[PDB]
Amino acid sequence: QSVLTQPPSASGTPGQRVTISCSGSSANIGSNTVNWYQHLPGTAPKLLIYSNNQRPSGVPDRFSGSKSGTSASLAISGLQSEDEADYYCAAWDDSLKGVFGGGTKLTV
Amino acid sequence: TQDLFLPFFSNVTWFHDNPVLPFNDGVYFASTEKSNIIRGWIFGTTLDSKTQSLLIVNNVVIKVCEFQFCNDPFFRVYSNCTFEYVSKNLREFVFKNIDGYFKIYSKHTPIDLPQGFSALEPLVDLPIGINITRFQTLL
Amino acid sequence: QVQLVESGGVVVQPGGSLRLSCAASGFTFHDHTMHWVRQAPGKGLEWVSLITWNGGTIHYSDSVKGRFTISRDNSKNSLYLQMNSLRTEDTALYYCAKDLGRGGWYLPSDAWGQGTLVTV
Amino acid sequence: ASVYAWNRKRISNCVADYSVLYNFSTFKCYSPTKLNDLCFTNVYADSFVIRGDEVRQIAPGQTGKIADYNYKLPDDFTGCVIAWNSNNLDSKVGGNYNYLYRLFRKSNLKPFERDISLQSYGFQPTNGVGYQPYRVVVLSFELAPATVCGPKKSTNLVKNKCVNFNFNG
Ligand SMILES: *[C@@H]1O[C@H](CO)[C@@H](O)[C@H](O)[C@H]1NC(C)=O
Ligand SMILES: *[C@@H]1O[C@H](CO)[C@@H](O)[C@H](O)[C@H]1NC(C)=O
Ligand SMILES: *[C@@H]1O[C@H](CO)[C@@H](O)[C@H](O)[C@H]1NC(C)=O
């Protein structure tokens, strides 16, 4: 029940690197930018990545991403036990308005 | 003593009139006036805002800056600065430029160029790292 | 030091209405675009609406379009969301968030409030 | 000045008695006790206001919103970075919008570049330390005969005795 498509989960050993993919139509990703959020249970979602590969203050260089074609992805390196959070893909649509994906659960 | 001096009985150019003149190891300048027309001197190289230029205008104001000078300066002298300082008769001057210092000597006496002997006392030692190859009299 | 505080997380009978309020401080209010996002229990984030700094444009998600109204008061540094014709499907944790910067807009940025729970 | 539009005060033709500064919460030189023994062609005091958590960005080898988009220092910087808390000076209730910083830029700044081509600081008296305003002055040392030098010390004059004297060198 979403437009942007993401995997239900991701996992790895601390110190390793994982990626979370995101896909949609040309009206979702192809003609727009992709933002990512890191949502730690117990509080609100926070911005992780914006405009494909930019970071807000407070977010370390272990978090980066990219956009190409009609798809986008988030890369998480140096996995820490404190990053066990739900990551979300979002973009502005040409037909619809604000679009968020289901979210990916990243676990240790 | 061994130093830069004006040779005795040397050839001296008499201006009546104020083109840009070359500057070598140092120069001698003297003027004879009744009406006090000469105001100061301009020292430097290209004098076109590309390099530092030394502008001395009689109070007495001394500036070193990237000035764009007029083709015929006289207020119409010029149109990024490193130094600024503010303070019938013959006025003798000596202008030297050694090891980053612009040295000025002078002597004023009551009165062609008169014959006689006197020594010029030092006026000021200016710590200005300026390249001087040309200068002009400002009227 | 950006802070956003939501209020109005109460229980309301289906078919009724509820207004939410977000207090804002720590940034220029009157020049910034602000957004609402809700999270239904067991689900991911669902975008609701945005209002720009000058009221120049307003956008709604289709599921709330025509039934939700967004407004702001730049003299009180506050954002409001009026949600009518409510259904049990609207049960969600509502969050107040600001955009990346002044003038323009895109999506909710880094500063999110704690949010409040709305039950229908 | 605002960090996006930091101002430069030029120091020249004077005695740089640095003991008035050395003896502030931050005083990091890139030795702070030997400043009075040095002469400079010029000294430049770059003055601006930033947040507490941005103070760490005012240094060689550092990156961040200030280091990259407002006030960049070179890896071979010579000089001293001095900073102190100004919570009771530059803060207002609701946020002091007088001070601004650059949040977005196409590319990073060069050392000592001043680009004023922009977001306000939410400076408030009740902010956490990391979000409180700090006044930062960076003293850049340019290494001419030199015009900026430390102070000279002196004693007194003793006459009619064998003494070891030094008169202006
Ligand atoms: C000075 O130079 C001129 C040529 O310009 C020459 O005719 C004159 O004899 C010279 N005078 C002396 C004393 O050398
Ligand atoms: C001349 O101006 C430039 C800026 O355009 C500056 O970088 C340079 O240092 C200035 N020159 C001097 C001697 O101050
Ligand atoms: C002239 O400029 C050169 C640099 O090209 C410098 O090394 C030299 O010392 C300068 N001379 C004077 C008299 O300033």
mmCIF file of C-alpha atoms in Angstrom, chain B:
data_model
loop_
_atom_site.group_PDB
_atom_site.id
_atom_site.type_symbol
_atom_site.label_atom_id
_atom_site.label_comp_id
_atom_site.label_asym_id
_atom_site.label_seq_id
_atom_site.Cartn_x
_atom_site.Cartn_y
_atom_site.Cartn_z
ATOM 1 C CA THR B 1 82.273 56.381 3.773
ATOM 2 C CA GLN B 2 80.948 54.230 0.934
ATOM 3 C CA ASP B 3 77.366 55.019 -0.070
ATOM 4 C CA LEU B 4 75.080 56.312 -2.815
ATOM 5 C CA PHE B 5 75.924 59.972 -3.374
ATOM 6 C CA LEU B 6 75.384 62.571 -6.058
ATOM 7 C CA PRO B 7 78.853 62.805 -7.746
ATOM 8 C CA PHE B 8 80.551 66.178 -7.536
ATOM 9 C CA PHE B 9 80.170 68.366 -10.617
ATOM 10 C CA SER B 10 77.759 65.863 -12.174
ATOM 11 C CA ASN B 11 75.248 66.474 -14.975
ATOM 12 C CA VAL B 12 71.841 67.457 -13.529
ATOM 13 C CA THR B 13 68.603 67.688 -15.508
ATOM 14 C CA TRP B 14 66.752 70.999 -15.162
ATOM 15 C CA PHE B 15 62.977 70.946 -15.632
ATOM 16 C CA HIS B 16 60.921 74.154 -16.030
ATOM 17 C CA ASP B 17 57.012 70.194 -17.125
ATOM 18 C CA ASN B 18 57.002 66.884 -15.248
ATOM 19 C CA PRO B 19 57.241 63.578 -17.191
ATOM 20 C CA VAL B 20 57.725 60.187 -15.590
ATOM 21 C CA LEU B 21 61.396 59.710 -14.734
ATOM 22 C CA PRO B 22 63.395 56.498 -14.073
ATOM 23 C CA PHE B 23 64.555 55.541 -10.578
ATOM 24 C CA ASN B 24 67.832 53.669 -10.170
ATOM 25 C CA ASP B 25 69.677 53.042 -6.904
ATOM 26 C CA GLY B 26 68.324 56.322 -5.564
ATOM 27 C CA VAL B 27 67.727 59.856 -6.786
ATOM 28 C CA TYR B 28 68.426 63.469 -5.933
ATOM 29 C CA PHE B 29 65.649 66.021 -6.185
ATOM 30 C CA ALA B 30 65.741 69.741 -5.563
ATOM 31 C CA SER B 31 63.435 72.626 -6.297
ATOM 32 C CA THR B 32 63.625 76.398 -6.315
ATOM 33 C CA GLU B 33 60.338 78.182 -5.796
ATOM 34 C CA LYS B 34 58.612 81.433 -4.953
ATOM 35 C CA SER B 35 54.972 80.383 -5.337
ATOM 36 C CA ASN B 36 55.273 76.855 -3.907
ATOM 37 C CA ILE B 37 53.838 74.864 -6.833
ATOM 38 C CA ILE B 38 55.276 71.411 -6.149
ATOM 39 C CA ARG B 39 53.058 69.371 -3.838
ATOM 40 C CA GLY B 40 54.592 65.917 -3.748
ATOM 41 C CA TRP B 41 55.940 62.838 -5.495
ATOM 42 C CA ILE B 42 54.629 59.599 -6.955
ATOM 43 C CA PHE B 43 56.848 56.511 -6.778
ATOM 44 C CA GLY B 44 56.316 53.012 -8.158
ATOM 45 C CA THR B 45 56.506 50.865 -11.292
ATOM 46 C CA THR B 46 53.415 50.598 -13.495
ATOM 47 C CA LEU B 47 51.249 52.987 -11.430
ATOM 48 C CA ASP B 48 48.065 51.348 -12.769
ATOM 49 C CA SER B 49 46.475 49.664 -9.735
ATOM 50 C CA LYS B 50 48.306 46.413 -10.519
ATOM 51 C CA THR B 51 51.060 46.953 -7.950
ATOM 52 C CA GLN B 52 51.681 48.917 -4.764
ATOM 53 C CA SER B 53 52.446 52.586 -5.375
ATOM 54 C CA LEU B 54 53.817 55.220 -2.999
ATOM 55 C CA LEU B 55 52.007 58.555 -2.939
ATOM 56 C CA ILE B 56 53.570 61.418 -0.986
ATOM 57 C CA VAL B 57 51.570 64.645 -0.798
ATOM 58 C CA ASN B 58 52.428 67.747 1.277
ATOM 59 C CA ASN B 59 49.935 68.476 6.538
ATOM 60 C CA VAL B 60 52.003 65.684 4.912
ATOM 61 C CA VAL B 61 50.189 62.500 3.935
ATOM 62 C CA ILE B 62 51.964 59.328 2.838
ATOM 63 C CA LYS B 63 50.084 56.344 1.428
ATOM 64 C CA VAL B 64 51.032 53.017 -0.124
ATOM 65 C CA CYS B 65 48.212 51.472 -2.168
ATOM 66 C CA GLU B 66 47.195 49.943 -5.493
ATOM 67 C CA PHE B 67 46.388 53.331 -6.995
ATOM 68 C CA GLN B 68 45.194 53.851 -10.558
ATOM 69 C CA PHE B 69 46.982 57.047 -11.502
ATOM 70 C CA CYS B 70 45.892 59.613 -14.064
ATOM 71 C CA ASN B 71 47.790 59.997 -17.342
ATOM 72 C CA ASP B 72 48.618 63.525 -16.198
ATOM 73 C CA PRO B 73 48.096 63.768 -12.401
ATOM 74 C CA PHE B 74 47.775 67.075 -10.560
ATOM 75 C CA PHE B 75 42.304 66.781 -7.122
ATOM 76 C CA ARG B 76 43.023 64.666 -10.237
ATOM 77 C CA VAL B 77 45.739 62.268 -9.125
ATOM 78 C CA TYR B 78 44.184 58.808 -9.122
ATOM 79 C CA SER B 79 40.831 57.073 -9.476
ATOM 80 C CA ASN B 80 43.805 48.028 -1.442
ATOM 81 C CA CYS B 81 46.344 49.645 0.875
ATOM 82 C CA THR B 82 49.268 48.524 3.048
ATOM 83 C CA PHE B 83 50.632 51.699 4.649
ATOM 84 C CA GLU B 84 49.467 55.129 5.772
ATOM 85 C CA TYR B 85 51.234 57.917 7.657
ATOM 86 C CA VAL B 86 50.325 61.500 8.516
ATOM 87 C CA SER B 87 52.713 64.144 9.927
ATOM 88 C CA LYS B 88 63.453 82.538 -2.879
ATOM 89 C CA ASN B 89 63.866 79.110 -1.204
ATOM 90 C CA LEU B 90 65.656 75.881 -2.126
ATOM 91 C CA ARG B 91 64.363 72.497 -1.024
ATOM 92 C CA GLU B 92 66.779 69.580 -1.396
ATOM 93 C CA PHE B 93 65.722 65.937 -1.085
ATOM 94 C CA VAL B 94 67.269 62.489 -1.375
ATOM 95 C CA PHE B 95 65.207 59.380 -2.061
ATOM 96 C CA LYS B 96 66.696 55.917 -1.492
ATOM 97 C CA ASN B 97 65.169 52.431 -1.493
ATOM 98 C CA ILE B 98 67.261 49.860 0.368
ATOM 99 C CA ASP B 99 66.300 46.519 1.927
ATOM 100 C CA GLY B 100 62.595 47.340 2.208
ATOM 101 C CA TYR B 101 63.093 50.867 3.536
ATOM 102 C CA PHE B 102 62.282 54.044 1.667
ATOM 103 C CA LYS B 103 64.624 56.641 3.090
ATOM 104 C CA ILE B 104 64.033 60.361 2.792
ATOM 105 C CA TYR B 105 66.564 63.106 3.549
ATOM 106 C CA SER B 106 65.947 66.840 3.266
ATOM 107 C CA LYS B 107 67.302 70.360 3.738
ATOM 108 C CA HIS B 108 65.615 73.752 3.425
ATOM 109 C CA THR B 109 67.565 76.970 2.819
ATOM 110 C CA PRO B 110 66.808 80.589 1.728
ATOM 111 C CA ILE B 111 68.004 81.851 -1.658
ATOM 112 C CA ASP B 112 69.880 78.414 -11.566
ATOM 113 C CA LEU B 113 71.106 75.788 -9.035
ATOM 114 C CA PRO B 114 73.222 77.689 -6.424
ATOM 115 C CA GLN B 115 76.796 76.780 -5.546
ATOM 116 C CA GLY B 116 77.682 75.988 -1.939
ATOM 117 C CA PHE B 117 77.966 73.175 0.582
ATOM 118 C CA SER B 118 75.575 71.686 3.113
ATOM 119 C CA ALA B 119 74.558 68.246 4.333
ATOM 120 C CA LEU B 120 71.025 66.851 4.348
ATOM 121 C CA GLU B 121 69.648 65.446 7.592
ATOM 122 C CA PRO B 122 67.370 62.351 7.537
ATOM 123 C CA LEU B 123 63.623 62.948 7.661
ATOM 124 C CA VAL B 124 61.943 59.551 7.839
ATOM 125 C CA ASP B 125 62.594 55.826 7.449
ATOM 126 C CA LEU B 126 59.516 54.181 5.942
ATOM 127 C CA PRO B 127 59.230 50.342 6.282
ATOM 128 C CA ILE B 128 57.648 49.919 2.861
ATOM 129 C CA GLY B 129 58.372 46.820 0.769
ATOM 130 C CA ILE B 130 57.745 48.688 -2.492
ATOM 131 C CA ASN B 131 59.335 48.231 -5.931
ATOM 132 C CA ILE B 132 60.304 51.656 -7.330
ATOM 133 C CA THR B 133 61.634 51.967 -10.869
ATOM 134 C CA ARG B 134 59.818 55.143 -11.899
ATOM 135 C CA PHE B 135 58.689 58.360 -10.252
ATOM 136 C CA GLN B 136 56.919 61.604 -11.109
ATOM 137 C CA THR B 137 56.704 65.101 -9.634
ATOM 138 C CA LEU B 138 53.191 66.081 -8.568
ATOM 139 C CA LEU B 139 52.334 69.732 -9.194
#
